[PDB]
Amino acid sequence: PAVHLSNGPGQEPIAVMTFDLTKITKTSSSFEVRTWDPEGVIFYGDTNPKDDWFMLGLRDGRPEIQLHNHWAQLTVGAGPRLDDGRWHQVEVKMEGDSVLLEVDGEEVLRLRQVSGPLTSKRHPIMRIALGGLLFPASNLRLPLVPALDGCLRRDSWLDKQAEISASAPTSLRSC
Amino acid sequence: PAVHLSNGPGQEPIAVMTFDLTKITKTSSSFEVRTWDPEGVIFYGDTNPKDDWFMLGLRDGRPEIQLHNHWAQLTVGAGPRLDDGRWHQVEVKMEGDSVLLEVDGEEVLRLRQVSGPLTSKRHPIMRIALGGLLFPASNLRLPLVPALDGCLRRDSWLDKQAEISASAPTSLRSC
Ligand SMILES: C[C@]12CC[C@@H]3c4ccc(O)cc4CC[C@H]3[C@@H]1CC[C@@H]2O
Ligand SMILES: C[C@]12CC[C@@H]3c4ccc(O)cc4CC[C@H]3[C@@H]1CC[C@@H]2O
Ligand SMILES: [Ca+2]
Ligand SMILES: [Ca+2]
């Protein structure tokens, strides 16, 4: 079952999941994405919209991560273009103080020394928004137009056991 | 003609080139490297060893860039492993406020919003050291053992016209 990463204008996310960081036993996520869209947000996450946020998106067809927290502030592009209309497996996880990005089974990016343990964040609640941000795009380190015209499927986010709740503005439109 | 990136213990660089930034008309470099060594420095560069430095090396066989300046401080791994004993083409250049890394003709990493124009650096003199750093490895953001047992060939560094001088401790040992 595949869902549309964009719905309507393409402003707000198609879904927001909230997690209790003190209950996480897994700090990784994975999913498949397919699109012809060269720019947009795949997912945004934060423990604090001002002080500790993260965004994985596409720019010029390639993955881009923006991260802003106490330890690091960055805007980094990496990996092959994914806007070739084919399904691509994507994994994002924490490994020690690093954030690793794997695409189609290959590690394409490792942001080192960027964060303390998820389970140790001052604000023990993490939000994960799909297909959109939880603040205006103008507030990104480097703005981009969030709308991502693509499909998401086979997605797993951290541990379902740590998930506090999940919301969706409109009905998840299938692909 | 190929030269050894390591000579002797593997502490100091095999060569140091100095450039006048006010005369540069090209902010890119390229070379080929071959090695079985998973860790080490390919090249280091700075306009200031304390406040504005850069290091391209290998860690776990993959490219890693560390950069420290007024705009950004990072430690980032990216691209495929290069320690497969085969020749690999590598290009490192500035594009706007970004630093791009291309391997075997493919862009594998783009560090965005990391620097003002090279021609505008307070200290208009850039040093490029090959196979080593110009400060102790303990001073890196993330230390690694600098010795890189590999070969370098077909190397071009910025513009020869902007090169002020070049030095080499020992005789460049051919591969
Ligand atoms: C945990 C994830 C990787 C690490 C990400 C991170 C990493 C560091 C940080 O300071 C904040 C965030 C928020 C979103 C997180 C992501 C949500 C799912 C993904 O697996
Ligand atoms: C200009 C190069 C890319 C950009 C690098 C950089 C980029 C930003 C910075 O603040 C310092 C340096 C020093 C070394 C530079 C490199 C030396 C050769 C390479 O082409
Ligand atoms: Ca788009
Ligand atoms: Ca080594």
mmCIF file of C-alpha atoms and ligand atoms in Angstrom:
data_model
loop_
_atom_site.group_PDB
_atom_site.id
_atom_site.type_symbol
_atom_site.label_atom_id
_atom_site.label_comp_id
_atom_site.label_asym_id
_atom_site.label_seq_id
_atom_site.Cartn_x
_atom_site.Cartn_y
_atom_site.Cartn_z
ATOM 1 C CA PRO A 1 0.000 0.000 0.000
ATOM 2 C CA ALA A 2 1.494 3.332 -1.126
ATOM 3 C CA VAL A 3 0.492 6.810 0.008
ATOM 4 C CA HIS A 4 0.842 10.247 -1.593
ATOM 5 C CA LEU A 5 3.519 12.392 0.045
ATOM 6 C CA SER A 6 1.651 15.488 -1.070
ATOM 7 C CA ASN A 7 -2.052 16.245 -0.702
ATOM 8 C CA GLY A 8 -3.705 19.480 -1.764
ATOM 9 C CA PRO A 9 -1.474 22.570 -2.159
ATOM 10 C CA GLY A 10 1.498 20.809 -0.609
ATOM 11 C CA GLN A 11 1.929 23.041 2.437
ATOM 12 C CA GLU A 12 1.326 20.918 5.538
ATOM 13 C CA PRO A 13 2.486 17.318 6.077
ATOM 14 C CA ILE A 14 0.241 14.359 5.254
ATOM 15 C CA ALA A 15 0.828 12.960 8.735
ATOM 16 C CA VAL A 16 2.456 13.708 12.077
ATOM 17 C CA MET A 17 3.626 11.027 14.499
ATOM 18 C CA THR A 18 4.707 11.751 18.045
ATOM 19 C CA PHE A 19 7.151 9.568 20.006
ATOM 20 C CA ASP A 20 8.201 9.232 23.646
ATOM 21 C CA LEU A 21 11.997 9.298 23.506
ATOM 22 C CA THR A 22 12.385 7.648 26.913
ATOM 23 C CA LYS A 23 10.765 4.522 25.472
ATOM 24 C CA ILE A 24 12.704 4.161 22.245
ATOM 25 C CA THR A 25 14.766 1.006 21.790
ATOM 26 C CA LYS A 26 15.490 1.675 18.134
ATOM 27 C CA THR A 27 16.768 4.904 16.584
ATOM 28 C CA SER A 28 16.238 4.109 12.922
ATOM 29 C CA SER A 29 13.614 4.544 10.196
ATOM 30 C CA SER A 30 13.169 3.165 6.668
ATOM 31 C CA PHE A 31 10.817 3.497 3.720
ATOM 32 C CA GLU A 32 10.578 3.445 -0.044
ATOM 33 C CA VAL A 33 9.897 6.493 -2.127
ATOM 34 C CA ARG A 34 9.204 7.005 -5.835
ATOM 35 C CA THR A 35 8.960 10.396 -7.543
ATOM 36 C CA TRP A 36 9.812 12.574 -10.563
ATOM 37 C CA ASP A 37 9.841 15.675 -8.339
ATOM 38 C CA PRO A 38 13.352 17.183 -7.913
ATOM 39 C CA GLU A 39 12.529 19.197 -4.761
ATOM 40 C CA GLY A 40 10.527 18.802 -1.575
ATOM 41 C CA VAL A 41 10.370 17.446 1.946
ATOM 42 C CA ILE A 42 10.304 13.716 2.518
ATOM 43 C CA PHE A 43 10.122 14.073 6.320
ATOM 44 C CA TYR A 44 10.795 16.567 9.097
ATOM 45 C CA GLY A 45 11.456 15.756 12.737
ATOM 46 C CA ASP A 46 12.065 17.650 15.944
ATOM 47 C CA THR A 47 12.130 17.624 19.718
ATOM 48 C CA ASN A 48 11.930 21.443 19.484
ATOM 49 C CA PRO A 49 10.922 23.452 16.343
ATOM 50 C CA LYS A 50 13.321 26.196 17.300
ATOM 51 C CA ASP A 51 16.271 24.414 18.873
ATOM 52 C CA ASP A 52 16.428 20.831 17.723
ATOM 53 C CA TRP A 53 15.052 19.981 14.301
ATOM 54 C CA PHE A 54 15.870 17.846 11.246
ATOM 55 C CA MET A 55 14.673 17.686 7.633
ATOM 56 C CA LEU A 56 15.320 15.066 4.940
ATOM 57 C CA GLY A 57 14.234 16.217 1.525
ATOM 58 C CA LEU A 58 15.231 16.394 -2.117
ATOM 59 C CA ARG A 59 16.975 19.274 -3.868
ATOM 60 C CA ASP A 60 18.041 18.980 -7.487
ATOM 61 C CA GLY A 61 16.724 15.428 -7.270
ATOM 62 C CA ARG A 62 19.175 14.427 -4.558
ATOM 63 C CA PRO A 63 18.774 13.792 -0.843
ATOM 64 C CA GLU A 64 19.450 16.805 1.352
ATOM 65 C CA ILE A 65 19.546 16.922 5.117
ATOM 66 C CA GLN A 66 19.213 20.075 7.177
ATOM 67 C CA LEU A 67 19.779 19.757 10.896
ATOM 68 C CA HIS A 68 19.813 22.351 13.655
ATOM 69 C CA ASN A 69 20.593 21.542 17.273
ATOM 70 C CA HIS A 70 22.990 22.358 20.101
ATOM 71 C CA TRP A 71 25.796 20.352 18.493
ATOM 72 C CA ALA A 72 25.536 21.051 14.793
ATOM 73 C CA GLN A 73 23.831 23.222 12.203
ATOM 74 C CA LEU A 74 24.104 22.012 8.623
ATOM 75 C CA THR A 75 22.700 21.825 5.096
ATOM 76 C CA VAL A 76 24.125 18.866 3.218
ATOM 77 C CA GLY A 77 23.337 17.232 -0.139
ATOM 78 C CA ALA A 78 24.404 13.634 -0.899
ATOM 79 C CA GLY A 79 23.628 10.434 -2.812
ATOM 80 C CA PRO A 80 22.259 9.804 -6.314
ATOM 81 C CA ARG A 81 19.257 11.557 -7.766
ATOM 82 C CA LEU A 82 16.092 9.780 -6.651
ATOM 83 C CA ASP A 83 13.717 11.568 -9.001
ATOM 84 C CA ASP A 84 13.919 8.913 -11.705
ATOM 85 C CA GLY A 85 10.426 7.558 -11.177
ATOM 86 C CA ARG A 86 11.770 4.346 -9.624
ATOM 87 C CA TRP A 87 11.234 2.976 -6.107
ATOM 88 C CA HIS A 88 14.164 3.715 -3.796
ATOM 89 C CA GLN A 89 14.821 2.243 -0.364
ATOM 90 C CA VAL A 90 15.879 4.895 2.195
ATOM 91 C CA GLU A 91 17.114 4.380 5.740
ATOM 92 C CA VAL A 92 17.909 7.101 8.260
ATOM 93 C CA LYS A 93 19.397 6.185 11.597
ATOM 94 C CA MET A 94 21.479 7.308 14.525
ATOM 95 C CA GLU A 95 24.770 5.519 15.165
ATOM 96 C CA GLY A 96 26.636 6.880 18.143
ATOM 97 C CA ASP A 97 26.816 10.648 17.661
ATOM 98 C CA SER A 98 26.197 10.328 13.931
ATOM 99 C CA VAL A 99 23.233 10.344 11.579
ATOM 100 C CA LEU A 100 23.568 7.879 8.700
ATOM 101 C CA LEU A 101 21.693 7.937 5.445
ATOM 102 C CA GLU A 102 21.484 4.811 3.295
ATOM 103 C CA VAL A 103 19.914 4.730 -0.175
ATOM 104 C CA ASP A 104 19.180 1.489 -2.027
ATOM 105 C CA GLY A 105 21.254 -0.368 0.538
ATOM 106 C CA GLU A 106 24.333 1.853 0.212
ATOM 107 C CA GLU A 107 25.572 4.305 2.852
ATOM 108 C CA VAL A 108 25.697 7.663 1.031
ATOM 109 C CA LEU A 109 26.080 10.055 3.913
ATOM 110 C CA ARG A 110 27.255 10.107 7.528
ATOM 111 C CA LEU A 111 26.906 13.298 9.524
ATOM 112 C CA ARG A 112 29.312 12.903 12.397
ATOM 113 C CA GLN A 113 29.334 14.515 15.826
ATOM 114 C CA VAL A 114 25.833 15.930 15.372
ATOM 115 C CA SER A 115 23.840 14.815 18.339
ATOM 116 C CA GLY A 116 23.635 13.450 21.824
ATOM 117 C CA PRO A 117 21.470 10.317 22.422
ATOM 118 C CA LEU A 118 17.834 10.618 21.358
ATOM 119 C CA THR A 119 16.866 9.180 24.737
ATOM 120 C CA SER A 120 18.729 12.093 26.373
ATOM 121 C CA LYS A 121 17.131 15.090 24.621
ATOM 122 C CA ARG A 122 15.924 17.766 27.067
ATOM 123 C CA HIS A 123 12.453 17.525 25.510
ATOM 124 C CA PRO A 124 11.726 13.745 25.522
ATOM 125 C CA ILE A 125 9.085 14.030 22.794
ATOM 126 C CA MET A 126 9.900 13.757 19.090
ATOM 127 C CA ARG A 127 7.557 14.686 16.260
ATOM 128 C CA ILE A 128 7.976 13.231 12.757
ATOM 129 C CA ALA A 129 6.062 14.925 9.963
ATOM 130 C CA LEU A 130 5.778 13.330 6.535
ATOM 131 C CA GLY A 131 5.769 15.361 3.339
ATOM 132 C CA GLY A 132 6.025 18.687 5.132
ATOM 133 C CA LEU A 133 7.562 20.810 7.887
ATOM 134 C CA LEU A 134 6.211 21.929 11.252
ATOM 135 C CA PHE A 135 7.348 25.522 10.701
ATOM 136 C CA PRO A 136 7.412 27.872 7.668
ATOM 137 C CA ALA A 137 9.849 26.936 4.860
ATOM 138 C CA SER A 138 11.408 30.383 5.232
ATOM 139 C CA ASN A 139 12.689 29.195 8.632
ATOM 140 C CA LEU A 140 14.791 26.430 7.121
ATOM 141 C CA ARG A 141 18.540 27.003 7.070
ATOM 142 C CA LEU A 142 18.148 26.989 3.280
ATOM 143 C CA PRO A 143 14.568 27.356 2.080
ATOM 144 C CA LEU A 144 13.115 25.037 -0.509
ATOM 145 C CA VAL A 145 9.522 24.543 -1.673
ATOM 146 C CA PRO A 146 8.253 21.660 0.541
ATOM 147 C CA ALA A 147 5.741 20.060 -1.826
ATOM 148 C CA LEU A 148 7.028 16.631 -2.864
ATOM 149 C CA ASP A 149 4.951 14.947 -5.568
ATOM 150 C CA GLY A 150 5.794 11.339 -4.863
ATOM 151 C CA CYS A 151 4.749 8.150 -3.153
ATOM 152 C CA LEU A 152 5.747 6.557 0.120
ATOM 153 C CA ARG A 153 5.377 2.892 1.040
ATOM 154 C CA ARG A 154 6.816 0.219 3.333
ATOM 155 C CA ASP A 155 7.581 2.868 5.953
ATOM 156 C CA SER A 156 8.694 2.097 9.496
ATOM 157 C CA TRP A 157 9.357 4.907 11.987
ATOM 158 C CA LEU A 158 11.464 4.110 15.074
ATOM 159 C CA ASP A 159 9.436 1.747 17.323
ATOM 160 C CA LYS A 160 5.659 1.537 17.211
ATOM 161 C CA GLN A 161 5.916 0.844 20.934
ATOM 162 C CA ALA A 162 7.327 4.329 21.525
ATOM 163 C CA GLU A 163 4.726 6.027 19.338
ATOM 164 C CA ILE A 164 2.523 8.271 21.484
ATOM 165 C CA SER A 165 0.090 9.253 18.713
ATOM 166 C CA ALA A 166 -0.398 9.893 15.015
ATOM 167 C CA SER A 167 -2.496 12.488 13.217
ATOM 168 C CA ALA A 168 -3.431 13.192 9.610
ATOM 169 C CA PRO A 169 -5.176 16.346 8.321
ATOM 170 C CA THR A 170 -6.865 14.665 5.354
ATOM 171 C CA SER A 171 -7.351 11.021 4.365
ATOM 172 C CA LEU A 172 -4.100 9.431 3.208
ATOM 173 C CA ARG A 173 -4.522 9.280 -0.569
ATOM 174 C CA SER A 174 -3.288 6.004 -2.032
ATOM 175 C CA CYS A 175 -0.952 5.810 -5.029
ATOM 176 C CA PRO B 1 53.599 9.789 -13.244
ATOM 177 C CA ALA B 2 52.255 8.740 -9.824
ATOM 178 C CA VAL B 3 53.553 9.783 -6.416
ATOM 179 C CA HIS B 4 53.323 8.185 -2.967
ATOM 180 C CA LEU B 5 50.905 9.980 -0.648
ATOM 181 C CA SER B 6 52.894 8.725 2.316
ATOM 182 C CA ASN B 7 56.655 8.846 2.831
ATOM 183 C CA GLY B 8 58.442 7.656 5.948
ATOM 184 C CA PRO B 9 56.396 7.387 9.176
ATOM 185 C CA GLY B 10 53.423 9.139 7.618
ATOM 186 C CA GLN B 11 53.338 12.192 9.880
ATOM 187 C CA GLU B 12 54.004 15.261 7.730
ATOM 188 C CA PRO B 13 52.650 15.899 4.214
ATOM 189 C CA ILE B 14 54.638 14.951 1.113
ATOM 190 C CA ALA B 15 54.190 18.472 -0.236
ATOM 191 C CA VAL B 16 52.837 21.908 0.625
ATOM 192 C CA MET B 17 51.655 24.419 -1.969
ATOM 193 C CA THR B 18 50.859 28.023 -1.166
ATOM 194 C CA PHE B 19 48.411 30.154 -3.180
ATOM 195 C CA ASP B 20 47.582 33.857 -3.438
ATOM 196 C CA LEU B 21 43.797 33.964 -3.123
ATOM 197 C CA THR B 22 43.526 37.400 -4.737
ATOM 198 C CA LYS B 23 44.842 35.877 -7.965
ATOM 199 C CA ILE B 24 42.676 32.785 -8.206
ATOM 200 C CA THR B 25 40.388 32.487 -11.221
ATOM 201 C CA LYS B 26 39.471 28.882 -10.515
ATOM 202 C CA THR B 27 38.308 27.397 -7.213
ATOM 203 C CA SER B 28 38.544 23.714 -8.050
ATOM 204 C CA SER B 29 41.007 20.820 -7.794
ATOM 205 C CA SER B 30 41.129 17.279 -9.208
ATOM 206 C CA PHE B 31 43.299 14.182 -9.038
ATOM 207 C CA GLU B 32 43.287 10.411 -9.114
ATOM 208 C CA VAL B 33 44.028 8.267 -6.122
ATOM 209 C CA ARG B 34 44.508 4.519 -5.666
ATOM 210 C CA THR B 35 44.861 2.776 -2.302
ATOM 211 C CA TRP B 36 43.956 -0.197 -0.080
ATOM 212 C CA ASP B 37 44.276 2.004 3.021
ATOM 213 C CA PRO B 38 40.905 2.647 4.757
ATOM 214 C CA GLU B 39 42.062 5.725 6.720
ATOM 215 C CA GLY B 40 44.239 8.777 6.203
ATOM 216 C CA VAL B 41 44.537 12.289 4.848
ATOM 217 C CA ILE B 42 44.398 12.880 1.123
ATOM 218 C CA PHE B 43 44.850 16.660 1.477
ATOM 219 C CA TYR B 44 44.524 19.459 4.016
ATOM 220 C CA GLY B 45 44.052 23.139 3.259
ATOM 221 C CA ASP B 46 43.779 26.367 5.196
ATOM 222 C CA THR B 47 43.960 30.137 5.184
ATOM 223 C CA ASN B 48 44.393 29.865 8.981
ATOM 224 C CA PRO B 49 45.321 26.651 10.913
ATOM 225 C CA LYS B 50 43.174 27.744 13.810
ATOM 226 C CA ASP B 51 40.223 29.518 12.229
ATOM 227 C CA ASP B 52 39.758 28.405 8.660
ATOM 228 C CA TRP B 53 40.849 24.906 7.715
ATOM 229 C CA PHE B 54 39.695 21.925 5.630
ATOM 230 C CA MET B 55 40.640 18.243 5.383
ATOM 231 C CA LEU B 56 39.649 15.616 2.804
ATOM 232 C CA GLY B 57 40.582 12.129 3.873
ATOM 233 C CA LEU B 58 39.362 8.559 4.107
ATOM 234 C CA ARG B 59 37.699 6.906 7.090
ATOM 235 C CA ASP B 60 36.381 3.366 6.858
ATOM 236 C CA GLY B 61 37.476 3.521 3.228
ATOM 237 C CA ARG B 62 35.147 6.393 2.397
ATOM 238 C CA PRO B 63 35.749 10.079 1.745
ATOM 239 C CA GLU B 64 35.416 12.292 4.801
ATOM 240 C CA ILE B 65 35.574 16.055 4.934
ATOM 241 C CA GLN B 66 36.246 18.068 8.063
ATOM 242 C CA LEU B 67 35.905 21.818 7.792
ATOM 243 C CA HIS B 68 36.220 24.556 10.389
ATOM 244 C CA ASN B 69 35.628 28.222 9.641
ATOM 245 C CA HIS B 70 33.479 31.195 10.619
ATOM 246 C CA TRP B 71 30.449 29.787 8.798
ATOM 247 C CA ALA B 72 30.511 26.073 9.469
ATOM 248 C CA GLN B 73 32.181 23.362 11.517
ATOM 249 C CA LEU B 74 31.597 19.817 10.320
ATOM 250 C CA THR B 75 32.752 16.207 10.032
ATOM 251 C CA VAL B 76 31.017 14.446 7.168
ATOM 252 C CA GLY B 77 31.476 11.055 5.479
ATOM 253 C CA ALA B 78 30.128 10.390 1.956
ATOM 254 C CA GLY B 79 30.568 8.452 -1.292
ATOM 255 C CA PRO B 80 31.660 4.873 -2.019
ATOM 256 C CA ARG B 81 34.669 3.217 -0.470
ATOM 257 C CA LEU B 82 37.778 4.135 -2.447
ATOM 258 C CA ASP B 83 40.105 1.623 -0.824
ATOM 259 C CA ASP B 84 39.554 -1.044 -3.467
ATOM 260 C CA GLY B 85 42.978 -0.735 -5.046
ATOM 261 C CA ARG B 86 41.532 0.923 -8.159
ATOM 262 C CA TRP B 87 42.207 4.407 -9.554
ATOM 263 C CA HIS B 88 39.489 6.899 -8.618
ATOM 264 C CA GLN B 89 38.963 10.376 -10.037
ATOM 265 C CA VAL B 90 38.250 12.981 -7.314
ATOM 266 C CA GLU B 91 37.219 16.602 -7.739
ATOM 267 C CA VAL B 92 36.770 19.151 -4.966
ATOM 268 C CA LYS B 93 35.447 22.583 -5.775
ATOM 269 C CA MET B 94 33.639 25.632 -4.510
ATOM 270 C CA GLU B 95 30.287 26.498 -6.079
ATOM 271 C CA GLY B 96 28.712 29.582 -4.591
ATOM 272 C CA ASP B 97 28.747 29.088 -0.821
ATOM 273 C CA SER B 98 29.099 25.327 -1.190
ATOM 274 C CA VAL B 99 31.897 22.787 -1.373
ATOM 275 C CA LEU B 100 31.214 19.953 -3.818
ATOM 276 C CA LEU B 101 32.872 16.582 -3.891
ATOM 277 C CA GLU B 102 32.736 14.445 -7.029
ATOM 278 C CA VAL B 103 34.067 10.879 -7.221
ATOM 279 C CA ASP B 104 34.465 9.006 -10.508
ATOM 280 C CA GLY B 105 32.447 11.713 -12.219
ATOM 281 C CA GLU B 106 29.504 11.573 -9.801
ATOM 282 C CA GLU B 107 28.603 14.271 -7.267
ATOM 283 C CA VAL B 108 28.579 12.440 -3.913
ATOM 284 C CA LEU B 109 28.542 15.325 -1.494
ATOM 285 C CA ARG B 110 27.612 19.009 -1.357
ATOM 286 C CA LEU B 111 28.297 20.956 1.810
ATOM 287 C CA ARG B 112 26.064 23.982 1.580
ATOM 288 C CA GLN B 113 26.372 27.394 3.198
ATOM 289 C CA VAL B 114 29.920 26.704 4.380
ATOM 290 C CA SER B 115 32.027 29.542 3.144
ATOM 291 C CA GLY B 116 32.370 33.016 1.777
ATOM 292 C CA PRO B 117 34.361 33.492 -1.489
ATOM 293 C CA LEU B 118 37.931 32.192 -1.430
ATOM 294 C CA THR B 119 39.023 35.510 -2.920
ATOM 295 C CA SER B 120 37.464 37.244 0.113
ATOM 296 C CA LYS B 121 39.135 35.372 2.994
ATOM 297 C CA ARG B 122 40.672 37.716 5.592
ATOM 298 C CA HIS B 123 44.011 35.938 5.120
ATOM 299 C CA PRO B 124 44.489 35.928 1.301
ATOM 300 C CA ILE B 125 46.959 33.032 1.406
ATOM 301 C CA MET B 126 45.887 29.391 1.178
ATOM 302 C CA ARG B 127 48.095 26.407 1.944
ATOM 303 C CA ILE B 128 47.354 22.949 0.511
ATOM 304 C CA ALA B 129 49.188 20.025 2.070
ATOM 305 C CA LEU B 130 49.141 16.597 0.452
ATOM 306 C CA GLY B 131 49.074 13.393 2.470
ATOM 307 C CA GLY B 132 49.153 15.177 5.810
ATOM 308 C CA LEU B 133 47.941 18.013 8.035
ATOM 309 C CA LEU B 134 49.580 21.274 9.071
ATOM 310 C CA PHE B 135 48.645 20.775 12.730
ATOM 311 C CA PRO B 136 48.536 17.737 15.072
ATOM 312 C CA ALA B 137 45.865 15.100 14.291
ATOM 313 C CA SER B 138 44.561 15.549 17.833
ATOM 314 C CA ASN B 139 43.432 19.033 16.740
ATOM 315 C CA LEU B 140 41.060 17.681 14.115
ATOM 316 C CA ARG B 141 37.360 17.870 14.932
ATOM 317 C CA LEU B 142 37.501 14.063 14.883
ATOM 318 C CA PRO B 143 41.012 12.630 15.012
ATOM 319 C CA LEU B 144 42.138 9.967 12.596
ATOM 320 C CA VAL B 145 45.607 8.575 11.866
ATOM 321 C CA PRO B 146 46.828 10.721 8.911
ATOM 322 C CA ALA B 147 49.069 8.206 7.145
ATOM 323 C CA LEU B 148 47.497 7.277 3.805
ATOM 324 C CA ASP B 149 49.278 4.456 1.982
ATOM 325 C CA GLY B 150 48.250 5.237 -1.561
ATOM 326 C CA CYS B 151 49.195 6.897 -4.808
ATOM 327 C CA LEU B 152 48.312 10.239 -6.324
ATOM 328 C CA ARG B 153 48.501 11.157 -10.004
ATOM 329 C CA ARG B 154 47.044 13.557 -12.571
ATOM 330 C CA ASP B 155 46.627 16.204 -9.872
ATOM 331 C CA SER B 156 45.700 19.816 -10.560
ATOM 332 C CA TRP B 157 45.386 22.326 -7.706
ATOM 333 C CA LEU B 158 43.438 25.549 -8.356
ATOM 334 C CA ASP B 159 45.451 27.678 -10.841
ATOM 335 C CA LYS B 160 49.191 27.321 -11.298
ATOM 336 C CA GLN B 161 49.133 31.058 -11.964
ATOM 337 C CA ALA B 162 47.994 31.716 -8.393
ATOM 338 C CA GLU B 163 50.551 29.352 -6.874
ATOM 339 C CA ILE B 164 53.032 31.335 -4.774
ATOM 340 C CA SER B 165 55.337 28.405 -3.960
ATOM 341 C CA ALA B 166 55.622 24.680 -3.362
ATOM 342 C CA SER B 167 57.763 22.731 -0.914
ATOM 343 C CA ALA B 168 58.504 19.066 -0.281
ATOM 344 C CA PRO B 169 60.362 17.645 2.748
ATOM 345 C CA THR B 170 61.740 14.586 0.953
ATOM 346 C CA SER B 171 61.922 13.591 -2.717
ATOM 347 C CA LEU B 172 58.505 12.660 -4.094
ATOM 348 C CA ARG B 173 58.668 8.864 -4.281
ATOM 349 C CA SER B 174 57.131 7.507 -7.472
ATOM 350 C CA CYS B 175 54.596 4.669 -7.521
HETATM 351 C C1 LIG C 1 15.392 9.226 14.393
HETATM 352 C C2 LIG C 1 15.506 9.838 12.961
HETATM 353 C C3 LIG C 1 17.006 10.105 12.659
HETATM 354 C C4 LIG C 1 17.597 11.207 13.553
HETATM 355 C C5 LIG C 1 16.794 12.534 13.463
HETATM 356 C C6 LIG C 1 17.359 13.642 14.381
HETATM 357 C C7 LIG C 1 18.740 13.720 14.709
HETATM 358 C C8 LIG C 1 19.260 14.697 15.528
HETATM 359 C C9 LIG C 1 18.420 15.680 16.078
HETATM 360 O O1 LIG C 1 18.977 16.626 16.888
HETATM 361 C C10 LIG C 1 17.033 15.643 15.774
HETATM 362 C C11 LIG C 1 16.493 14.653 14.943
HETATM 363 C C12 LIG C 1 14.978 14.673 14.659
HETATM 364 C C13 LIG C 1 14.479 13.606 13.648
HETATM 365 C C14 LIG C 1 15.243 12.279 13.753
HETATM 366 C C15 LIG C 1 14.736 11.178 12.781
HETATM 367 C C16 LIG C 1 13.251 10.758 12.847
HETATM 368 C C17 LIG C 1 13.265 9.313 12.250
HETATM 369 C C18 LIG C 1 14.739 9.005 11.944
HETATM 370 O O2 LIG C 1 14.954 7.587 12.094
HETATM 371 C C1 LIG C 2 39.816 25.091 -2.995
HETATM 372 C C2 LIG C 2 39.649 23.667 -2.381
HETATM 373 C C3 LIG C 2 38.152 23.461 -2.016
HETATM 374 C C4 LIG C 2 37.694 24.384 -0.876
HETATM 375 C C5 LIG C 2 38.574 24.233 0.395
HETATM 376 C C6 LIG C 2 38.144 25.178 1.540
HETATM 377 C C7 LIG C 2 36.796 25.595 1.709
HETATM 378 C C8 LIG C 2 36.395 26.440 2.720
HETATM 379 C C9 LIG C 2 37.331 26.927 3.647
HETATM 380 O O1 LIG C 2 36.892 27.765 4.629
HETATM 381 C C10 LIG C 2 38.690 26.534 3.519
HETATM 382 C C11 LIG C 2 39.109 25.676 2.493
HETATM 383 C C12 LIG C 2 40.600 25.294 2.413
HETATM 384 C C13 LIG C 2 40.962 24.260 1.313
HETATM 385 C C14 LIG C 2 40.122 24.423 0.040
HETATM 386 C C15 LIG C 2 40.491 23.428 -1.095
HETATM 387 C C16 LIG C 2 41.946 23.399 -1.611
HETATM 388 C C17 LIG C 2 41.799 22.814 -3.053
HETATM 389 C C18 LIG C 2 40.291 22.607 -3.265
HETATM 390 O O2 LIG C 2 39.994 22.780 -4.665
HETATM 391 CA CA CA C 3 8.369 19.676 -5.443
HETATM 392 CA CA CA C 4 46.191 4.771 6.925
#
